[PDB]
Amino acid sequence: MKLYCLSGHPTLPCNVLKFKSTTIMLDCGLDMTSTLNFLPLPLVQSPRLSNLPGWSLKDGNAFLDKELKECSGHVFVDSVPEFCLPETELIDLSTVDVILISNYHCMMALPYITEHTGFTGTVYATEPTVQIGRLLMEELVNFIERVPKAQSASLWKNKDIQRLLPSPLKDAVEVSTWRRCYTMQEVNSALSKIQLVGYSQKIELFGAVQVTPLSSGYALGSSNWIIQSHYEKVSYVSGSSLLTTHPQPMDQASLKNSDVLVLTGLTQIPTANPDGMVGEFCSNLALTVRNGGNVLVPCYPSGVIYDLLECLYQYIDSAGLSSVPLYFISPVANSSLEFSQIFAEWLCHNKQSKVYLPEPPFPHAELIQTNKLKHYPSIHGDFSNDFRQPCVVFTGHPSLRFGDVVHFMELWGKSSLNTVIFTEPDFSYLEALAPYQPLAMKCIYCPIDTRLNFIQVSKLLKEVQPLHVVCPEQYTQPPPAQSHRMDLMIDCQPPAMSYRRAEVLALPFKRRYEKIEIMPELADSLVPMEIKPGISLATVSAVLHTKDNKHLLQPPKPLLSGSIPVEQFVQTLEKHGFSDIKVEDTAKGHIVLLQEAETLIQIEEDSTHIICDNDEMLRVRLRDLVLKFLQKF
Amino acid sequence: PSKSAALHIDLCKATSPADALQYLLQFARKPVEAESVEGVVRILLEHYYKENDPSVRLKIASLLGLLSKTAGFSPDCIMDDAINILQNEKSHQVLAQLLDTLLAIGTKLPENQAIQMRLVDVACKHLTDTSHGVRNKCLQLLGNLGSLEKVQKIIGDYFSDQDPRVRTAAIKAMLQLHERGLKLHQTIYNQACKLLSDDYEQVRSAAVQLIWVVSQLYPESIRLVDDAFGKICHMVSDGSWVVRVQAAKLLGSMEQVSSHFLEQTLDKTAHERAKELYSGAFVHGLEDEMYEVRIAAVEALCMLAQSSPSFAEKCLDFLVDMFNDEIEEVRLQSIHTMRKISNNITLREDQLDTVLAVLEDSSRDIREALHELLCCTNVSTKEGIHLALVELLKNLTKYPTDRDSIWKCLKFLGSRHPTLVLPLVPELLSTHPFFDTAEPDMDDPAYIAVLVLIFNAAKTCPTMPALFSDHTFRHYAYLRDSLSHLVPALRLPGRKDPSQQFLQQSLERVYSLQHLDPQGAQELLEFTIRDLQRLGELQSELAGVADFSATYLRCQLLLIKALQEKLWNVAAPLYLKQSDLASAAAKQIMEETYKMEFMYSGVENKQVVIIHHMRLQAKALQLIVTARTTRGLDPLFGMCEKFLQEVDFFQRYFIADLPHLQDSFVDKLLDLMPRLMTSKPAEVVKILQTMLRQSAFLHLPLPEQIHKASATIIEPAGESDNPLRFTSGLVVALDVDATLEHVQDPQNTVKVQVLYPDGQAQMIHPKPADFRNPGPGRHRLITQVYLSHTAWTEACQVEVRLLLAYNEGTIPFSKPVKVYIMPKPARR
């Protein structure tokens, strides 16, 4: 069973597994870290972004001052932001049968694969995952659009120049395969190729395999996949979170008893304590608002935002800051809020009960009804009229490379009272903020993560006891941040064989048994017989019918095994009618002579030879006499 | 070279999963060979193919397939691939890549027999796999390899094989066989009869297509097309929703069918109950899960209703009832299908129901569609016309914005059947027998609405002007004067290329008159320029060529006026500016060259070379003036070298048409070029001066019909004194709406420019999606422009303009508009 890893990212995997006569791809991860290398996409051109000085090739042969620009002694490319892709050329994706989705973050890259390659297979995902994915892709398309930055810097992409270019540009990967953002017609085609699935729905593929999504708990609708035939198990776990959260609690029960366990999407900041760091969030926000500045907060309009909003809802009354309003600005803010409200069956038990007691499960509905929190499509329009200060503004894109956050933060950077508070842990906020540096704005880094940490990983591995474990090489090797620490690298027995970007692996498994069904008529017809204690066997004879890779047997050459004792041979010959049979012994066998037809039989260990005259009736009589002194196989 | 280096590097690395993968990814990612070295690269790859870990071999085969698209390879690659496949039977993936490569080779170029499509097909057939290795791919391979117009046996057995995926592969191969004809046999019909009931998805989805395609060929089973149609009918209720789309579309496409059986689809009713009061496949298909299948159903119904002149009357109720579907798309499709089948159809009682819908909230599309339907419907009863009239009047009085369509629908409703309205004439317009009715207001758009009906009806019936009252005659004259596309001419007693030649004449006169004093030349050019502008304004179809030639002559006049300046009569060191108008003349002439080259639509190579020669002329003039003013030998030499480089670039680039450029400035300059290269710039400038003095005037060839681009900013109007207000630092979105006429590649050129008061100009590229194309060469631009700035004490003016870019520089081609902006500072 061959496993292909087509994305070196430790959190946004793309894994093509092969099983029986089927090929299954898991996840379509869009490494949106690569976008960091490009300049921001302003909503309105600002002089400082416009007039940035040009980095120059030291040789000067190439005219790279136009492509590259430098700020704070650093270098950035200058074009429309870009995105890295999974390496699609390892295997023709067109031969891929089924695609599975883990979570809205892991399905971000879906259109590229679903449309361009000619993929004709089906796609599976949970209802909230597909909806919120259609929301995020809409947001991304809108952000990249709305200010088409036509420029296309391509000379820098060359490998030879890339070698000379300074860091981090030296650090780019597969710079060649980068592709511009997709469009809405592709998005619609992708989302229309999808088909839905609920939790624990046992989807059978051609009878060839059986796939099941199980509650993960990371976010609202994230699913850990389980692929099984009747005698195997491959558990693909991507982004679970056993902490106490709003999504449906993680179910480890079915995970145990797994042949192969693919593990992905561990935490990003292992040392981060979610609860204490949310406390730091609230304290810092309160202090800044009391100082009277303005607070900016980048965050995807989903996921962690809702937990953050519950915490803020409970904490605001603690300091009595009712005066300061919360603005939530994004082209999908309203839709995301309503979709979070409707999905009750997927939330935690507490919230499902809050629904059974008629009331909207989340409290941000109560916030909106109270008018403390106001959601707006984008800064242009009504928000401009209804602005206030001081305030707390939830922007759209935490990549800091585009959206409404870039404009707000070019607006507020000059001041020092104002503060930007990072929460989404997916991007190195240092590189994120590099282009805007210098900045008087106080920068606070409190990155909230909820994915399982290494200790819980060890617990789960011991609880499930897998036959094999497969994880990214980043986990196996200790993080570069703390080479000293040992808890920061995964541990298992046998050791988790690792992998890297664009790698091919062969699982240490062999196909031995598979499932086939007998039919009752033949079952009744068959008569078991025993040779050993507790072992009853019977020779079989039938015709197989195969449908949809499912096999069945119905009624329409076995051989011999076992020595024939000469004493019983002669006894049964005499009691059946034979006479004048004389037996002599040899070193290891017996020679028995029957006078009729002059039949001589030599019986040795695992050897019996009969020699008679040209006879047919007596020959067949001897055949049926001797064959019935053993067990037929 | 590159291929050899890659092969050497791969051999040296020899890393199992690392070196091979990296080399393959780099080779595929970077680029194709783009040369005959593809064969050598393929040989090298096949050399290393003898290894382990068939993943590397699969990647190599993928690279070979990608390279095969270059069309360079032919029989060598085919033979090599055949040899490799003959012994590379290992697992399924390797055979998969090999089959894919073979398919690529076969359909890439050869498309021929003689071991170009026959040997490969035979090899694939003989290479039938045991377990899903290639089965589907070899099926599609033989599908794209059409043997001849004589193969179906093998697929016949494969239809009932193990895997539904392979069944789909066989079905698609069959489709590929049909699309090239191949006169499929009849037995496939009976074979696919069971395929219909395959109890798995993705199988029936195309089995339906197969049954349709075979059936439509010839209707002879016992009834064949009727049987297939019955099968499709019994299937229309498939469990899925994906199948039903094909089910509906295919039966719609079908056209010939037994009449008696056709109505059995619609036979079940409250509809017949209503009919008496006044006096199953589709029955279920019309009301289904999601609107896609409803759309497919209505389309199929319209198609086959068109096909069969009968069966329409049976379907009018089934259409009309399905108006309040709640899906605007289904609404529109129902209206459209009713229109498309509106012929020889009667609405004895359906009139009121189909007209009740005319009152929608705005539903501008729906109401317009209803008007379109009415203008093409048919009614038979006088009370029907009266009823339609009264509901139309209610429509007009409630939605006084589409009267412009109400009138046209009434016009057609009259012309279609005039005699029906004649009895209404006394009643509809008040004509109290012995009272002189007070003139109803002439412009009231209900009286005009009811008059246009009568007048359009009056073309046919001669007797009715007798019924016409006193006013109606002068009112008819007024209408026929105002709305000439609604009321035709009647019998009422009360109302019983010199331009182009002249343009050529003037242009050739200017051409001819060149042997005379520059004083006279200036006046001649001025007369003819104002002449041409006048003619361009007068005409509209010549507005392009007229203005084009006008700008050209203006360019020449500017050059002559610059040359005849007083500057040349004073020594070089005495140059003192404030008189050297040539300085601005050069910039103006160059800008005009840009304008003429880019803005106009239809331009030929001859005209382009004329323009580029004139641009070179302007460059020479600029050089001469600059040298006149500057004495520095080094700057002089630099500029002279640049100019000579420009001349050389011109002559190389437009190597052609130089013989046509007789006795031209460029012609004589090039003829005398070498000595100019040898000489010092100080004398080169004087040579250029005299050269221009004695230079001739080229003859510009007039083109075929052309136009000059033109933009008109409609929104924002800009005359609204009310400022747009917003908090400081934030942004306000200004809707920009424009019409661009006669522009090539609008999306890659037009750009919106915003000039703020403080002197800063921001350029905005609109999205490629902002440009709608209602008609020929007349695009609409709709977009948002984002404005922002710190707080202003009072309202200011932000200027919006449309620019045209070229490949460097920009040309305004539109009237700037002003928008009032007011950023107030932040609140509490």
Curated annotation (Swiss-Prot), chain A:
SUBUNIT field: Component of the Integrator complex, composed of core subunits INTS1, INTS2, INTS3, INTS4, INTS5, INTS6, INTS7, INTS8, INTS9/RC74, INTS10, INTS11/CPSF3L, INTS12, INTS13, INTS14 and INTS15. The core complex associates with protein phosphatase 2A subunits PPP2CA and PPP2R1A, to form the Integrator-PP2A (INTAC) complex. INTS9 is part of the RNA endonuclease subcomplex, composed of INTS4, INTS9, INTS11 and inositol hexakisphosphate (InsP6). Interacts with WDR73; interaction is required for the assembly of the RNA endonuclease subcomplex in the cytoplasm.
Gene name per UniProt: INTS9
Pfam families noted in UniProt: Beta-Casp, IntS9_C, Lactamase_B_6
Major subcellular site: nucleus
Entry keyword annotation includes Signal: no
Residue location of crosslink Glycyl lysine isopeptide (Lys-Gly) (interchain with G-Cter in SUMO2): 58
GO biological process, one term: snRNA processing
Protein name per UniProt: Integrator complex subunit 9
Keywords: Cytoplasm, Isopeptide bond, Nucleus, Ubl conjugation
Superkingdom as given in the UniProt entry: Eukaryota
Any further remark recorded for this protein: Although strongly related to RNA-specific endonuclease proteins, it lacks the HXHXDH motif that binds zinc and participates in the catalytic center. Its function as endonuclease is therefore unsure.
Summary of the function given for this chain in its UniProt record: Component of the integrator complex, a multiprotein complex that terminates RNA polymerase II (Pol II) transcription in the promoter-proximal region of genes.
Subcellular location as annotated: Nucleus; Cytoplasm
InterPro entries associated with the record: Beta_Casp, Integrator_9su, IntS9-like_C, Metallo-B-lactamas, RibonucZ/Hydroxyglut_hydro
Organism: Homo sapiens
Keyword Cytoplasm attached: yes
Known outcome of mutating residue 619 to E: Abolished interaction with INTS11
Recorded GO CC terms: cytoplasm; cytosol; INTAC complex; integrator complex; nucleoplasm; nucleus
Family: Belongs to the metallo-beta-lactamase superfamily. RNA-metabolizing metallo-beta-lactamase-like family. INTS9 subfamily.
Residues binding 1D-myo-inositol hexakisphosphate, per UniProt: 2, 19, 510-511
Curated annotation (Swiss-Prot), chain B:
Site of covalent link Glycyl lysine isopeptide (Lys-Gly) (interchain with G-Cter in SUMO2): 680
InterPro entries: ARM-like, ARM-type_fold, INTS4_8HBD
Cross-link Glycyl lysine isopeptide (Lys-Gly) (interchain with G-Cter in SUMO1): residue positions: 680
UniProt keywords, alphabetically: Acetylation, Cytoplasm, Isopeptide bond, Nucleus, Repeat, Ubl conjugation
UniProt signal peptide: none
Recorded consequence of changing residue 165 to A: Decreased processing activity of the Integrator complex
Molecular functions (GO terms): protein-macromolecule adaptor activity
Keyword match RNA-binding: no
Family, similarity comment: Belongs to the Integrator subunit 4 family.
Role this protein plays: Component of the integrator complex, a multiprotein complex that terminates RNA polymerase II (Pol II) transcription in the promoter-proximal region of genes.
Protein name, per record: Integrator complex subunit 4
Taxonomic path: Eukaryota, Metazoa, Chordata, Craniata, Vertebrata
Chain's gene name: INTS4
